[PDB]
């Protein structure tokens, strides 16, 4: 697992460090398949993101939907940039909440406002919305 000490190091360049670490811990504690990763966003600059899967029930079954939540250095004042990350055995379902690049669009992200908006609330919304319209489907 990851420690708060290691997280603080990862967000050293962030404007609101304690707040970002606090929510990250909350998220990875509840969602065991999400992992904090420090990587180059779009190959432009380094940012920490939460990568992995979240459990989403659809038509009676639960799926481990692969996602990636990029936390900007302005987190939590600005919402995260989120993507669905299909494996080779699946395809991105472009639609109301997902564009051609797998980027996620949600009213929750659009009107994001700290402190009423947070990652736990966002993920809860994803589970509900994706449970209605999956962002990815498996190849036949």
């Amino acid at each position: 697992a990851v420690s708060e000490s290691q997280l603080k190091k990862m967000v050293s360049k962030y404007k609101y460090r304690d707040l970002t670490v606090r929510e990250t811990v909350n998220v990875i504690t509840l969602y065991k398949d999400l992992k904090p990763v420090l990587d180059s966003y779009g190959g432009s600059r380094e940012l920490m993101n939460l990568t992995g899967t979240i459990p989403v029930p659809y038509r009676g079954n639960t799926y481990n939907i692969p996602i990636c939540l990029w936390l900007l250095d302005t987190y939590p004042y600005n919402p995260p940039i989120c993507f669905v990350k299909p494996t080779s055995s699946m395809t991105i379902k472009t639609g109301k909440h997902v564009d051609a690049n797998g980027k996620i669009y949600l009213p929750y992200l659009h009107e994001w406002k700290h402190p009423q908006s947070d990652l736990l609330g966002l993920i809860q919304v994803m589970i509900v919305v994706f449970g209605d319209e999956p962002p990815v489907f498996s190849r036949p």
């Binding site: 899967t53 659809y58 699946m90 990815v136």
Partner: peptide
């Protein structure tokens, strides 16, 4: 956990 997705409909 391994990434999974519902079958194409």
């Amino acid at each position: 956990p391994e990434p999974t997705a519902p079958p194409e409909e």
